[PDB]
Amino acid sequence: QVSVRPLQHTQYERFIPSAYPYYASAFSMMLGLFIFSIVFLHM
Amino acid sequence: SVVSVISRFLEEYLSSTPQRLKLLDAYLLYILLTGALQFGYCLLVGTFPFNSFLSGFISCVGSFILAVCLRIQINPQNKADFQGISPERAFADFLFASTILHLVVMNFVG
Amino acid sequence: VGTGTSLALSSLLSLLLFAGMQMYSRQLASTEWLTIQGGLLGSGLFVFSLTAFNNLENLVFGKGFQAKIFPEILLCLLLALFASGLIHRVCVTTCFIFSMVGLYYINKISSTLYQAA
Amino acid sequence: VDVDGTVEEDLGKSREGSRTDDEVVQ
Amino acid sequence: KRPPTVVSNTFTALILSPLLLLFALWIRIGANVSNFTFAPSTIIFHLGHAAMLGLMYVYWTQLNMFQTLKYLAILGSVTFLAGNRMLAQQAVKRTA
Amino acid sequence: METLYRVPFLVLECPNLKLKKPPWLHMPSAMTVYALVVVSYFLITGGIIYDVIVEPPSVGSMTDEHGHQRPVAFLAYRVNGQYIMEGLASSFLFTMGGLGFIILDRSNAPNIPKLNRFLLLFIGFVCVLLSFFMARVFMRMKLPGYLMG
Amino acid sequence: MITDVQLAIFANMLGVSLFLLVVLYHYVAVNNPKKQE
Amino acid sequence: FGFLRLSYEKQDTLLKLLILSMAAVLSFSTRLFAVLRFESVIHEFDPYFNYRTTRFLAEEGFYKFHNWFDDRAWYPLGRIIGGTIYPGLMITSAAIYHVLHFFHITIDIRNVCVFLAPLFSSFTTIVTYHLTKELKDAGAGLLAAAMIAVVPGYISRSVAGSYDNEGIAIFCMLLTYYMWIKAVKTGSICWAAKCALAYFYMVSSWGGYVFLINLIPLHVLVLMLTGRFSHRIYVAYCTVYCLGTILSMQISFVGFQPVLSSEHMAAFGVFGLCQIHAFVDYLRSKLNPQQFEVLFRSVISLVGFVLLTVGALLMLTGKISPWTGRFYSLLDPSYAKNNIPIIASVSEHQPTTWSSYYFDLQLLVFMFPVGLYYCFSNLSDARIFIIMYGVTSMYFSAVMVRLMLVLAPVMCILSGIGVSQVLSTYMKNLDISRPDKKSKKQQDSTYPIKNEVASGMILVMAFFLITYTFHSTWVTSEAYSSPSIVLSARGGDGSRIIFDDFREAYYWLRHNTPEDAKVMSWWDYGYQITAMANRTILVDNNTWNNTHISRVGQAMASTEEKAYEIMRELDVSYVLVIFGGLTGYSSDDINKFLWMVRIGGSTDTGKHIKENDYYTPTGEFRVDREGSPVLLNCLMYKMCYYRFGQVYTEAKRPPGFDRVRNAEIGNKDFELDVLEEAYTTEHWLVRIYKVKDLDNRGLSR
Ligand SMILES: [C][C]([C][C]/[C]=C(\[C])[C][C]/[C]=C(/[C])[C][C][C]=C([C])[C])[C][C]OP([O])(=O)OP([O])([O])=O[C]1O[C]([C][O])[C](O[C]2O[C]([C][O])[C]([O])[C]([O])[C]2[N]C([C])=O)[C]([O])[C]1[N]C([C])=O
Numbered sequence A: 001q002v003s004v005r006p007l008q009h010t011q012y013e014r015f016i017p018s019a020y021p022y023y024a025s026a027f028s029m030m031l032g033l034f035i036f037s038i039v040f041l042h043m
Numbered sequence B: 001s002v003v004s005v006i007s008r009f010l011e012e013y014l015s016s017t018p019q020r021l022k023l024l025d026a027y028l029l030y031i032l033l034t035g036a037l038q039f040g041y042c043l044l045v046g047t048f049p050f051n052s053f054l055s056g057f058i059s060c061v062g063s064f065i066l067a068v069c070l071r072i073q074i075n076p077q078n079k080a081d082f083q084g085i086s087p088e089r090a091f092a093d094f095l096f097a098s099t100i101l102h103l104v105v106m107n108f109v110g
Numbered sequence C: 001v002g003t004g005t006s007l008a009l010s011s012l013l014s015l016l017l018f019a020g021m022q023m024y025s026r027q028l029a030s031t032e033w034l035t036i037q038g039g040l041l042g043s044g045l046f047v048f049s050l051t052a053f054n055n056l057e058n059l060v061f062g063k064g065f066q067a068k069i070f071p072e073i074l075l076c077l078l079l080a081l082f083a084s085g086l087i088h089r090v091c092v093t094t095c096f097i098f099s100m101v102g103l104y105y106i107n108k109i110s111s112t113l114y115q116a117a
Numbered sequence D: 001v002d003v004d005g006t007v008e009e010d011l012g013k014s015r016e017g018s019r020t021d022d023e024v025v026q
Numbered sequence E: 001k002r003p004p005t006v007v008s009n010t011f012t013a014l015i016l017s018p019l020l021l022l023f024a025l026w027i028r029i030g031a032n033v034s035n036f037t038f039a040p041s042t043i044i045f046h047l048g049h050a051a052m053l054g055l056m057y058v059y060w061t062q063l064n065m066f067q068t069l070k071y072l073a074i075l076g077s078v079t080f081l082a083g084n085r086m087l088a089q090q091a092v093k094r095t096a
Numbered sequence F: 001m002e003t004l005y006r007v008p009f010l011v012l013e014c015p016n017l018k019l020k021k022p023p024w025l026h027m028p029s030a031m032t033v034y035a036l037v038v039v040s041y042f043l044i045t046g047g048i049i050y051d052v053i054v055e056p057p058s059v060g061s062m063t064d065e066h067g068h069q070r071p072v073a074f075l076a077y078r079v080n081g082q083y084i085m086e087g088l089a090s091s092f093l094f095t096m097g098g099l100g101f102i103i104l105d106r107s108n109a110p111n112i113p114k115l116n117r118f119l120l121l122f123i124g125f126v127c128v129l130l131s132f133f134m135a136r137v138f139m140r141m142k143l144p145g146y147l148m149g
Numbered sequence G: 001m002i003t004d005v006q007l008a009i010f011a012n013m014l015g016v017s018l019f020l021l022v023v024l025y026h027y028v029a030v031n032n033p034k035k036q037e
Numbered sequence H: 001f002g003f004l005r006l007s008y009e010k011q012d013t014l015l016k017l018l019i020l021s022m023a024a025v026l027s028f029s030t031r032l033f034a035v036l037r038f039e040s041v042i043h044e045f046d047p048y049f050n051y052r053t054t055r056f057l058a059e060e061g062f063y064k065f066h067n068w069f070d071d072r073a074w075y076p077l078g079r080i081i082g083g084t085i086y087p088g089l090m091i092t093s094a095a096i097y098h099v100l101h102f103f104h105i106t107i108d109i110r111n112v113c114v115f116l117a118p119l120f121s122s123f124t125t126i127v128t129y130h131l132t133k134e135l136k137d138a139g140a141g142l143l144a145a146a147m148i149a150v151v152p153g154y155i156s157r158s159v160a161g162s163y164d165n166e167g168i169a170i171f172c173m174l175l176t177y178y179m180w181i182k183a184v185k186t187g188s189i190c191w192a193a194k195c196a197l198a199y200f201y202m203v204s205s206w207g208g209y210v211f212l213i214n215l216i217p218l219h220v221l222v223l224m225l226t227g228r229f230s231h232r233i234y235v236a237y238c239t240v241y242c243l244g245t246i247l248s249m250q251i252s253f254v255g256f257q258p259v260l261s262s263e264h265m266a267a268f269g270v271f272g273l274c275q276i277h278a279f280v281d282y283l284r285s286k287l288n289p290q291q292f293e294v295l296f297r298s299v300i301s302l303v304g305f306v307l308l309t310v311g312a313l314l315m316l317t318g319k320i321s322p323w324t325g326r327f328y329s330l331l332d333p334s335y336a337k338n339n340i341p342i343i344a345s346v347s348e349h350q351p352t353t354w355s356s357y358y359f360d361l362q363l364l365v366f367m368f369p370v371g372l373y374y375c376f377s378n379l380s381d382a383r384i385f386i387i388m389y390g391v392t393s394m395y396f397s398a399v400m401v402r403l404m405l406v407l408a409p410v411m412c413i414l415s416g417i418g419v420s421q422v423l424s425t426y427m428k429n430l431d432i433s434r435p436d437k438k439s440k441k442q443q444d445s446t447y448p449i450k451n452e453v454a455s456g457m458i459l460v461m462a463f464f465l466i467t468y469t470f471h472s473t474w475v476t477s478e479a480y481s482s483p484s485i486v487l488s489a490r491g492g493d494g495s496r497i498i499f500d501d502f503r504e505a506y507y508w509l510r511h512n513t514p515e516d517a518k519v520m521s522w523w524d525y526g527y528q529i530t531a532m533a534n535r536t537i538l539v540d541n542n543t544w545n546n547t548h549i550s551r552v553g554q555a556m557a558s559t560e561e562k563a564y565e566i567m568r569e570l571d572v573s574y575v576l577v578i579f580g581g582l583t584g585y586s587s588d589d590i591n592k593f594l595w596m597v598r599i600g601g602s603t604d605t606g607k608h609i610k611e612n613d614y615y616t617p618t619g620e621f622r623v624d625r626e627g628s629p630v631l632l633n634c635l636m637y638k639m640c641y642y643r644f645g646q647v648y649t650e651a652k653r654p655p656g657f658d659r660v661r662n663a664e665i666g667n668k669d670f671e672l673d674v675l676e677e678a679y680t681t682e683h684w685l686v687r688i689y690k691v692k693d694l695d696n697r698g699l700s701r
């Protein structure tokens, strides 16, 4: 008897090249938000 | 004519908007453009990977909505409705919400 | 035409359509196209029945009586729908749809004839 | 006679969850 | 199936373009930083807020969930204290 | 196409149609909704839904040494089983008790005659006391050991 | 260990007392002049 | 005069602390009846699955638990525990356990689970008072806390040892509502963020999160129809929706359901509508009214067509999943009974009767309308939500008995409001309590009896309140204090005799069988066997695979020869059946035999199995001489009644009589060709048979 198990969450592929646009959006949002905070307070 | 109406609507809006409010509108336009562009990519290239597309797209909407809430709370015209809330308190809450949004999208981005 | 003769004529046309629909109910439901043909017949029955009901109302209560959405219009529509169910369930969608399309134009016709005058 | 011990009634069995209906016949 | 790399790169660069537009509107509309001051609270608060956003990237590459929270709690506490002191000073100035 | 509909009306008298919103069709008043909810509450507590799915008889039958078929109203010893008649009778009591308080509250309003005030109070207490007390009797019959220790 | 009989009496006593106290709270609350000020 | 000299602010605070403190004590204490009367053990069938998971998580760590795959259940398919479970209950137990050990307080994990539920009941009491206080006043809140503490309906699933999801689900739900009410009322983003975070916690704890995600959109929609929509509503609802949706998705079990399922579409639709409504108002204010009509009509025509087309396309294409079977039934009652046998089979899915309502709630049922009447009389934005919460709970509680628990919280709060209003109004009628401001002239000479009227009204209300306590105590002691695993019987002398057969069989299997043995049983007992026997099982309570269960049903219902063929294919080693004839235990397999028949025939392979075949020609299910031939020769009948014919159950009845069916078995003497008797309990409650191997000589068995 041998048990076969599904893949663990860690084992899944990361940094998929096709998903780069999705990656860019999230990083872009943070940078824009911070810059807005700086200008808005001291306008 | 509708086209004439749009011209006057811009004309009144520019004069009647304080600079600080205008800055919000410019920021919102940037957020909307990024979100729409991502949506077009998904329907042209395909859903896969669903995890990445959904996480990125949701982040744009969360940022856009959060900015709008600040836009309304600070406005003097609506001051009576949000009784007891100073501008400083509203801004502090807005940053706190943004921090949570970035963290949760971060888990599901990959 | 005379109101009294008009009431009888509308009743006769509606009655004839209803009797024919029941007689050929089995054939009409056999095929989708025939069921659609039933939709046209049911709407026609609704139009004639509505005309008869208004004519009767005018004679009993005096000329110029105005038909309302309820219960005069609703009752006539309900009777037509009930006949549609007997032949087949499918018509109730098509039989209803034709009746509504006729109703809008009939109201447009009535407004021009009566309101303008 | 063989053994002793008569069960009581569970006046409130119904609340139990994920259990099969023991009264279909009735 | 996966899309061609060339299209994936093209969109990735394109997503950057709105950020350039955002600066263009602000510069043309009249952006100013005249109100800025060098008070210690003001500098500390911005630095803490920026660091917390930075920590997100570090979590992406190396940290796990438990580690990220442990650092985040300390960084949040300092940022909150700086923000509270800074806001009170700004409120007094506005109400003057 | 419009001409085709005109063809019958050339001989027939066209009906005069006024496509206006009916006068009676108004947005329900706040009190109106509350009344509608109360009647629904009567049915739901009555077990109307239980009756539809399980389809129990209105009344069952029993026997004794003297034999013969007693009708039964209460389903003895099973809490989750009921007859049609029993469920409605119990439900009505629950609604009545609630109303008794509301009428009592209205009776307390100022500027009411001496006769009116006394009469209203009597009804309020009768509904409340009978509704609550009767309900205990109904359960006591259904479960003989109720509150017994 | 306490027997079930003791636990049952204890539960009844606390509940009855607590409800009466809530009634007493209603008394003072209306009786409060500053509440109407 | 000592009390008088204290300031009124001191008096109100002191009473407030005393009332709340006592209520917490009562809530915890009342749940200990079972633990005192019986041993400190886990109750019911479902909790054991939670107990096994909780131990694994604490010992192994969160990361291992997250990826845990269990091969000991649903053999040979297996089950993925990590992605098919709700982690909320397990995480809470583990976290407290670590903290107590950290301080060198060494407590058993089993104790932590057993006593987890009573503690939360006390926490729920505090939350109730604050939520009620917001709606009306402090006085109502104190009443609500008292009612919630001893309500029998809540007690049924929160008694000590009831380690079930329901214990924590209610507390999370109330907290989320409390945050939501403050978010709308204040209109502050900070409250909105807190509400979303509470919502996420509930989503992990229970699978009933769906109820909240539909009720909240419904409340906002009603406000829009009634014209009460304001900027505060827009900020509170819209902010919560975005954070709540993303947070819920993190849970592995939920996955992508929020965006793809038809269950969650209602929240999405309302969110889109709010944006349209807000934008239109902004345009109207800026624009000239005469022009605004022209733009308003043109915009509606273009936008409405586009929106309608998109919605129709999504439903028709099937990108959005249709409603799940479980939820479809809750709405349409008939669907489950006619289409899905498995859902109908469960004994907590039946419709509710009137007796159930009174038994669980008693006085509250009388007071529920009164609370509704006052809320309708005084309409407020916060009040509107509570009305929506009530009127829906009533509908969904009749359909299913299990949902009663959801009903209990709303019932207590609303009933309290009614009692509070009545007490305040008459009590101030009693002038002796307050002279206050009075005018002797124009005092309403239609009034002779002020002192008497108030005194009677208050006294009667007190009488009802005290009775409510007595009824709640008696029901909990007599109904909810019984452990399922241990059965209590009365001896001939009237002594209390305990039957421990259920555990005894499990222990026998634990040490007396090969470790790799596979045991076959009905799905009801899957959790219990795995936790205590530590042996592999074929079916489990979760019933994630219908076809697997149906195949099991066919074997039991079929003849002896056919059953053997199926069993060999699945490598079954032992079969366990529960028989209650000797002891009068009603919930035996034979009563459940019919469900097995229907389930077995549901699948394509089970078409040969017809329910009517097992009945007498007259339509009767009987096990006596007149019983159907197929029934007497089925596998289940032989197993239960093997060698039982010669046993004298009663002195007054002939041998081979079955006490629970009150009938004598028709077939008394028979032999088991393919099964052998391995072990039987002292009272015969549990019978174990061993599967015989093939014939050494190849002869047909
Ligand atoms: C029922 C509940 C819920 C609540 C909710 C509500 C009431 C709401 C409603 C709705 C709505 C929408 C409303 C609104 C209105 C409008 C809009 C108009 C909950 C329940 O819970 P649960 O968790 O489920 O419990 P239990 O039972 O224990 O569970 C178990 O069991 C079940 C059965 O029953 C199962 O199921 C299953 O699942 C699965 C998944 O995996 C599937 O596959 C299958 O099929 C099924 N089966 C059946 C028979 O159904 C489940 O699962 C379980 N659980 C767990 C966790 O596992």
Ligand SMILES: *[C@@H]1O[C@H](CO)[C@@H](O[C@@H]2O[C@H](CO)[C@@H](O)[C@H](O)[C@H]2NC(C)=O)[C@H](O)[C@H]1NC(C)=O
Binding pocket: H515, H534
């Ligand atoms: C329950 O059964 C499992 C299945 O065998 C037992 O696991 C064994 O544990 C022993 C002692 O640690 C190990 O030597 C074996 O290798 C384990 N076997 C497997 C297949 O994992 C487990 O010990 C039992 N649980 C108890 C006794 O509480």
